[PDB]
Amino acid sequence: RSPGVVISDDEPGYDLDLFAIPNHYAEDLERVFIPHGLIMDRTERLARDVMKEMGGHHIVALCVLKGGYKFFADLLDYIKALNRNSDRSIPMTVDFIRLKKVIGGDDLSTLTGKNVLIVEDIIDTGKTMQTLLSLVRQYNPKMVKVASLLVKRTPRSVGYKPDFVGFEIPDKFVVGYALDYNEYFRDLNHVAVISETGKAKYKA
Amino acid sequence: SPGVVISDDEPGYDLDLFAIPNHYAEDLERVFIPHGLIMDRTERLARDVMKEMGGHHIVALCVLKGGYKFFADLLDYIKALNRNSDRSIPMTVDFIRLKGDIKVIGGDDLSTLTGKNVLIVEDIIDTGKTMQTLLSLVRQYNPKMVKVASLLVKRTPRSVGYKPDFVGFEIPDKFVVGYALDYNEYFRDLNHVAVISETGKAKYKA
Amino acid sequence: PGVVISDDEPGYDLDLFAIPNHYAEDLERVFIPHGLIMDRTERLARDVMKEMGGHHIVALCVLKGGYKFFADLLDYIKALNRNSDRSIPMTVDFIRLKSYDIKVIGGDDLSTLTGKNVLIVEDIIDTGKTMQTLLSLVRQYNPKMVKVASLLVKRTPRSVGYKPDFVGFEIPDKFVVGYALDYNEYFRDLNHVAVISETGKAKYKA
Amino acid sequence: RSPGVVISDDEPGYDLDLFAIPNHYAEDLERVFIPHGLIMDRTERLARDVMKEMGGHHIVALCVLKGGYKFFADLLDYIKALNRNSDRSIPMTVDFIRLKSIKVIGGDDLSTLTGKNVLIVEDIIDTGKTMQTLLSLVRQYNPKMVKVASLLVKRTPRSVGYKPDFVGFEIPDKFVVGYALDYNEYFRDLNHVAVISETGKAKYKA
Ligand SMILES: Nc1nc2c(ncn2[C@@H]2C[C@@H](COCCP(=O)(O)O)N(C(=O)CCP(=O)(O)O)C2)c(=O)[nH]1
Ligand SMILES: Nc1nc2c(ncn2[C@@H]2C[C@@H](COCCP(=O)(O)O)N(C(=O)CCP(=O)(O)O)C2)c(=O)[nH]1
Ligand SMILES: Nc1nc2c(ncn2[C@@H]2C[C@@H](COCCP(=O)(O)O)N(C(=O)CCP(=O)(O)O)C2)c(=O)[nH]1
Ligand SMILES: Nc1nc2c(ncn2[C@@H]2C[C@@H](COCCP(=O)(O)O)N(C(=O)CCP(=O)(O)O)C2)c(=O)[nH]1
Ligand SMILES: [Mg+2]
Ligand SMILES: [Mg+2]
Ligand SMILES: [Mg+2]
Ligand SMILES: [Mg+2]
Ligand SMILES: [Mg+2]
Ligand SMILES: [Mg+2]
Ligand SMILES: [Mg+2]
Ligand SMILES: [Mg+2]
């Protein structure tokens, strides 16, 4: 199916001075990699693709924190827009989980017999998603799909690819739009690349 | 300031004046606080948060699940301030569920709060007992400061008298849903704050 | 009939909202918050598409007061049309009404309206005289249909009885500014609709 | 100064199936050239640049219809957002004009521009001859300053040498539509900037 918006390995990105950038990170980012408004435009379209394939039965939206919170909130807002401007709509429930083994959610028995949409910020090797999916399938959901904002082109991939992708990106470390570098850079609406100064100041 | 005061005799708006998810058509009586009104109030709240807390690294604490919309929209408005001004501060986020010492579920170690400007984000304050006990727990990790932003505060004689630092709307003692406030997990997928209908209370009764 | 706002409606305190500093002392109350304007306009866009979405739409913006409603109304119409399975193209036009009965300045040859679904977008209907007259001028070129969306309709004893087809809000006979509604060319740069204070009315009096 | 966002001559664009596109233009478009969200992000930064240079005196924002209305609306929305989330801000008035094949159609009296800070807002500069002509008329009325913002500037050898003060994007010498930019009045109702396809150039040709 669709592999998303392909960002080539040689993408230059954009000069920071062409966009509005948080003052505290000005010296800490290299380039803007994916502008926030382009994330919205892509997400809008994924929202329609999601409803096409899953609007026929109750959806349980499952946000993988922390990185996924922003993508999850905006994906859901566009899905909500679809549901209030059209005759066809089905209820949605939401839940949140963090991965260490699953940390702090509803009991997974809520997923049984439901359309489960797992929402992720990034897929790298895909090992984590494979592991979460084999766990979720033990609870017998009607169906389980994975929406991920980014998929990284990496040789370390184990072969997993999600059902809805936003962008496919080089094997580069990106921050922003809730993706972090040691907890920092979540408070940034663009996806960006850290500068050298940057990763020093916030090294662990 | 108690925020935007909605009075006990406010009728709210007929469902037909607004766009409503069709599957909740029968289950809501009135729209209580339209989404765009929530946005406008949150915009102001974002400015008051930065004026008081912008001096030092903020840790924003979302109280799941009901707080997640208010949290994302408040942080969105704070982000918009920080990329359009000459002074801002880094801000990290964490998410927690709450169930005597209050049981905090998930979350980083609370030592991550030591010495930070901590902001707790809540969907609604009712008796105040939950924030009072969470505050009592957080102060023991020695934050620089700790403050609470709540979209909604209920006027109730059952209040233990706790007032949060930032409040969107002060509302009557009525059960409201929407904007991530649920009735048995339903109605989170609704952008307006609304009052639950009678058919809908029975239809979704646990 | 649209969102009805009553005579004794208080409005909202300026300090609960974000307000441009240069107008802080010039307004008495926020009358209709921006975000509430948007919520109603989303719904109106759906009515428009249902009634006129079957044939080419020509949307006519009545400058200057209409430009803000017009832009937002059309943006919610575009949002429907890239998320439906059957949409229709729309073209746009802009006009100003000058006396000496009504002169249509700017805008295309009215022959372009023949056979089209014509939507006239207006900021406020006061007496209804302007709209009645423009309608009679447009019906002369034989549009497939002509409809009026007005953001505001005033309640008045001096109304000549014209009623638009789509109404945002029905309001008292107060003097409101904001959201592109002006006083002596001022207050167009303000997202909320507000009532003008006495200080402000003197400060900008022509 | 900022030459704006430089879109190369070889830029491939994006496939239409990766974005939400109006149904009725499905076949009429080749690629998305500049997504609506990119335009927004860039405009947000032009609003800060505009304010930093013109924000010390009453601004008259002059929208050149019809192509400029979208960019005008969004630029002024980002400017308003700055003015209500900072301590100090300056008032702003708006006028609209249309050009005919040299002749300024509509608009207030050009004397309303004397001593003002005039911001002319344009969708596209190509040769620049029209902007030079417009400036030559505005300058007869002695503005305090006059500046031009253009969403798009074409890299063309046919350029007469004129450069605007604020530029969103520097684009190839090729024909784009959307975001109010039209082809025989069509494609204005589209939020992305895009390249017309063959079916489309033929379907709406003059
Ligand atoms: N910011 C950023 N993170 C990247 C990037 N590449 C890989 N990662 C990892 C990806 C994710 C989890 O890994 C599963 C992937 P897998 O498919 O390989 O198993 N991480 C977490 O820290 C989770 C905790 P959170 O932050 O959500 O609280 C960092 C990148 O380019 N940028
Ligand atoms: N939807 C809605 N809930 C209301 C309303 N009144 C009171 N509540 C409570 C508020 C909260 C508990 O907090 C007590 C705070 P208190 O200590 O100050 O009394 N609840 C939860 O279910 C938390 C789990 P969540 O849903 O977040 O996952 C229900 C109302 O009108 N509407
Ligand atoms: N701001 C504001 N104006 C009000 C209010 N009440 C009445 N008006 C009038 C209404 C409008 C003309 O409309 C008459 C339609 P009528 O024939 O039905 O009475 N005006 C214009 O100045 C048009 C030129 P513009 O401003 O678009 O360039 C002012 C109010 O409360 N607030
Ligand atoms: N859509 C689109 N138009 C382009 C493109 N290249 C040039 N044009 C022209 C540009 C403009 C006039 O401006 C002259 C600029 P110049 O003097 O600097 O050479 N036009 C109008 O039709 C104005 C009436 P409007 O439609 O606004 O009411 C079309 C392009 O790529 N796409
Ligand atoms: Mg993740
Ligand atoms: Mg991480
Ligand atoms: Mg709560
Ligand atoms: Mg609850
Ligand atoms: Mg008018
Ligand atoms: Mg007027
Ligand atoms: Mg032009
Ligand atoms: Mg043209």
Side-chain angles (χ1 to χ4, degrees), chain B residues 52-53 118-121 135 145-149 162 165-166:
Chain B
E52 235 177 295
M53 305 190 68
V118 172
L119 170 66
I120 300 162
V121 191
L135 282 175
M145 58 168 80
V146 51
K147 300 210 169 309
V148 171
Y162 173 74
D165 314 72
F166 314 100

Side-chain angles (χ1 to χ4, degrees), chain A residues 94-99 102-107:
Chain A
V94 314
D95 195 22
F96 297 84
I97 68 174
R98 193 186 316 191
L99 295 184
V102 162
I103 311 268
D106 290 357
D107 174 69

Side-chain angles (χ1 to χ4, degrees), chain A residues 152-170:
Chain A
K152 187 171 284 199
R153 279 187 311 277
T154 176
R156 313 192 308 132
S157 177
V158 301
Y160 178 73
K161 84 196 95 160
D163 308 273
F164 324 88
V165 174
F167 304 77
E168 160 207 287
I169 69 178

Side-chain angles (χ1 to χ4, degrees), chain B residues 63-67 97-98 122-131 152 154 158 171 173-178 180-183 185 188:
Chain B
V63 169
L64 295 168
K65 279 190 275 189
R97 262 167 192 104
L98 303 175
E122 262 282 21
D123 50 338
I124 182 164
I125 301 286
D126 192 4
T127 74
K129 263 188 294 283
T130 321
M131 276 309 96
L152 308 167
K154 260 182 180 175
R158 159 161 83 159
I171 63 165
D173 205 346
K174 304 172 202 163
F175 199 80
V176 293
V177 301
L181 283 97
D182 76 305
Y183 182 57
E185 296 314 316
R188 294 200 205 271

